[PDB]
Design a protein around this nucleic acid. Structure first.
Ligand SMILES: Nc1ncnc2c1ncn2[C@@H]1O[C@H](COP(=O)(O)OP(=O)(O)O)[C@@H](O)[C@H]1O
Ligand code: ALF
Ligand SMILES: [Mg+2]
Ligand SMILES: [Zn+2]
Ligand SMILES: [Zn+2]
Ligand SMILES: [Zn+2]
Length: 756
RNA sequence: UUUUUUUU
């Protein structure tokens, strides 16, 4: 009954985690969070109960209303425990709701701090000891490489360099994002004659393992795939096994989502292909990637009279010369600050390569939304685009769903396949014989569609999909600077002859969880290495996206003031606006909010209720000013804030709820390459320690400031952001303009925080 | 760090 970390034993201090049955105290000791919070965050556990002798007795904390038991959701209204959402928005006194977890530790009346005397039971413990102890419990419940080179002799040395780095990341991801009760199962038989288990971050097809250990039956394990998801029941279709399923058992089952390292697996396969598949890549590109010296090549290619496409953007001379130069090179690097038309230029290039060679082109980006964006532009130019989406996201809403391979299969299909599709939709099921027949026909149809496409669009990793068992001679990777080198390698090692890489090293880099891998240089993109090796990139420096006032800070802070404006204040102003900008003629403002951050539902992210609230007020205000939902974008660094802002407006939106769902809400990272007329930036971070996490990255702020065309509102807490040098420069820049404000939207005042 | 990627 003592804290499994340090040994504190006070009945008023310890908390039981219901999952593993271990006890933890509520003290911050060698840990940024209290020990109980630290355990929940790392282990992904949610449910806790107080000590019997505590001031509240043996009680499992749960919501009075719906009865959920995730502490990261729980708060109290005065007392009554209620979920953050939806229970705390529904109308005792909702407006005074406060979370049980405050400043990364439970409230004192839920779990006290130890007296000095009680603290004596606490053994000296380092952060290291605590960290390794959690890692150890992953398996057992117990107690307390050649460096990246400038030049590679050959592909095998290349592989032995990046390979172990990939594995490090993979192992750390698995240990970090793996998942984890008392499940009641109802059994049935699927038409295909497989066993179905129904019970109780998920998608149909996901592999799971179901197992039982207890006093009703010998140990049993079973693997299967998700075939139905909560509208309230989940349904897992089990694989055929030698040992029959215990269909007579109902309770005491455990289920576990199986971690897939698919992304890392495909990076390794690309590395191996590069070393081993002789048709995987051209000679020029091969040695280029190796870091060798190669004589520059030109393609014998007929140029068009005009590079710009009618009824679309008219390229400036730099963009035009760029497309002219690229059409004849095996390798091209397009570089430039935000909004310089890198993507429009790329779309033009793809368009022209298509007409000249009439040959399939592979188009990629690290993120899904960047892929969609580019696919849309290409479709607008009248190209036959096929968007290959991950199996995981086939049910995800998209702006280019009509281009998705799976939707193309359904549409414009006939005969036996048409029958099997209608049958599967109306019945919801297929027999064994019809399933094998269905799979054969779909593959045949998929191949035929992919083969006749002018362009195939997918994420870099998605390029490693098995459906793409064919050669792609020309590859364009947009936002390539967001990808690690092996990730970029995936689409390039498919018989590539001509490659175009677009990027900006001042915008977001790849996410490397493992610090040793990042230290070893896994953060360096292919785009960057090729440049540091002497490859001269085409540079674009005239920006066409945003009002000149919005480009000022980013230009001076990240691009040595080299970023020019191609559009004017008059081109980026709204003659009839009545939106309460602080200063006439300047469409930006930093609205200081003095809320505090909260830990999100999955225990690993953040949200900010006050910032979310004022976000709804900004949007509603814009609505009143006649600004349309499609013209507004909300970006935030944290997935926790993204989820909350979305749900919150669906409950508290002043106007028609349907208006608010059409307002895009995304993460900063996810939104790179995209733009909106109006942007709301929610910074989220606000705590006593003035810690701001990965907001320290200049490249994340850069992206956050460069999404808007007409207007930008920044919501944030200066008290904590100001400790950071970069953010301090931003606040000061806004203060100098008269745009740093506080108070209520309808009566904004100059911010009073003291900036030095 | 908490963000991108991904499932017969
Ligand atoms: N030559 C041009 N004339 C008019 N608008 C342009 C021109 N070049 C780019 N734009 C536009 O300015 C914005 C940014 O283009 P984009 O390709 O997304 O920039 P980047 O990819 O470098 O971030 C878009 O709204 C786009 O259509
Ligand atoms: F560089 Al961008 F949208 F691709 F600002
Ligand atoms: Mg772009
Ligand atoms: Zn402790
Ligand atoms: Zn636990
Ligand atoms: Zn609830």
């Amino acid at each position: 009954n003592s804290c499994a970390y340090c040994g504190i034993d006070s009945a008023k201090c310890v908390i039981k985690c219901n999952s593993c049955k271990k006890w933890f105290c509520n003290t911050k000791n060698g840990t940024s969070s209290s020990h109980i919070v630290n355990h929940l965050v790392l282990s992904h556990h949610n449910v806790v109960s107080l000590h019997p002798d505590s001031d509240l007795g043996d009680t499992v904390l749960e919501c009075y209303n719906c009865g959920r038991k995730n502490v990261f959701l729980l708060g109290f209204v005065s007392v009554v425990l209620l979920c953050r959402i939806p229970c705390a928005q529904t109308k005792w006194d909702t407006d005074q709701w406060q979370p049980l977890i405050e400043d990364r530790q439970l409230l004192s009346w839920v779990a006290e701090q130890p007296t000095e005397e009680e603290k004596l039971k606490a053994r000296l413990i380092t952060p290291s000891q605590i960290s390794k102890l959690e890692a150890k419990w992953r398996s057992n419940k117990d107690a307390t490489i050649p460096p990246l080179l400038l030049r590679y002799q050959d592909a095998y040395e290349y592989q032995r360099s990046y390979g172990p780095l990939i594995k490090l990341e993979a192992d750390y991801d698995k240990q970090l994002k793996e998942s984890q009760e008392h499940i009641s199962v109802s059994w049935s038989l699927a038409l295909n004659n497989r066993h179905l288990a129904s019970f109780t971050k998920v998608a149909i097809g996901d592999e799971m393992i179901l197992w039982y250990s207890g006093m009703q039956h010998p140990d049993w394990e079973g693997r299967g795939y998700i075939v139905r998801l909560p509208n309230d029941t989940f349904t897992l279709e089990l694989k055929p096994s030698k040992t029959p399923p215990p269909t007579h058992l109902t309770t005491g089952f455990t289920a576990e989502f199986i971690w897939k390292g698919t992304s890392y697996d495909r990076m390794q396969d690309a590395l191996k292909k590069f070393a081993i598949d002789k048709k995987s890549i051209s000679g020029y590109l091969y040695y280029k990637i190796l870091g060798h010296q190669v004589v520059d090549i030109s393609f014998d290619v007929p140029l068009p009279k005009e590079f710009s496409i009618p009824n679309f953007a008219q390229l400036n001379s730099s963009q035009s010369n760029a497309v002219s130069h690229v059409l004849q090179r095996p390798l091209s690097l397009i570089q430039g600050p935000p909004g310089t038309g890198k993507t429009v230029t790329s779309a033009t290039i793809v368009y022209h390569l298509s007409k000249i060679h009439k040959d399939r082109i592979l188009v990629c980006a690290p993120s899904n939304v960047a892929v969609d964006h580019l696919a849309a532009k290409l479709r607008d130019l009248g190209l036959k685009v096929v968007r290959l989406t991950a199996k995981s996201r086939e049910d995800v809403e998209s702006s280019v769903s009509n281009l998705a391979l799976h939707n193309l299969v359904g549409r414009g299909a006939k005969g036996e396949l048409k029958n099997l599709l209608k049958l599967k939709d109306e019945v919801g099921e297929l027999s064994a014989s019809d399933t094998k027949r269905f799979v054969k026909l779909v593959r045949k149809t998929e191949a035929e569609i992919l083969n006749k496409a002018d362009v195939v669009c997918c994420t870099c990793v998605g390029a490693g999909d098995k459906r793409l068992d064919t050669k792609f001679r020309t590859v364009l990777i947009d936002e390539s600077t967001q990808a690690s080198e092996p990730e970029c390698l995936i689409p390039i090692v498919k018989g590539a002859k001509q490659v175009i890489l677009v990027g900006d090293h001042q915008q977001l880099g790849p996410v490397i969880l493992e610090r040793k891998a990042a230290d070893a240089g896994l953060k360096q993109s292919l785009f960057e290495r090729l440049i540091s090796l002497g490859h001269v990139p085409i540079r674009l420096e005239v920006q066409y996206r945003m009002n000149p006032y919005l480009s000022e800070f980013p230009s001076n802070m990240f691009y040595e003031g080299s970023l020019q404006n191609g559009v004017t204040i008059e081109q980026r102003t709204v003659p009839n606006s009545k939106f309460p900008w602080p200063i006439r003629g300047i469409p930006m403002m930093f609205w200081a909010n003095y809320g505090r951050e909260e830990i999100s539902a999955n225990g690993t992210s953040f949200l900010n209720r006050i910032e979310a609230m004022n976000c709804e007020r900004i949007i509603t205000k814009l609505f009143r000013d006649g600004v349309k939902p499609e013209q507004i974008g909300v970006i935030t660094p944290y997935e926790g804030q993204r989820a909350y802002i979305l749900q919150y407006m669906q409950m508290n939106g002043s106007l028609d709820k349907d208006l608010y769902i059409k307002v895009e809400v995304a993460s900063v990272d996810a939104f790179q390459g995209r733009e909106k007329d109006y942007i709301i930036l929610s910074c989220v971070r606000a705590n006593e320690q003035q810690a701001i996490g990965f907001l320290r990255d200049p490249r994340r702020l850069n992206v956050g400031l460069t999404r808007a065309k007409y207007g930008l509102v920044i919501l944030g807490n200066p008290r904590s952001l100001a400790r950071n040098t970069l953010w301090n420069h931003l606040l000061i820049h806004f203060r100098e303009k008269g745009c740093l404000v506080e108070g209520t939207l309808d009566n904004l005042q100059l911010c009073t925080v003291q900036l030095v």
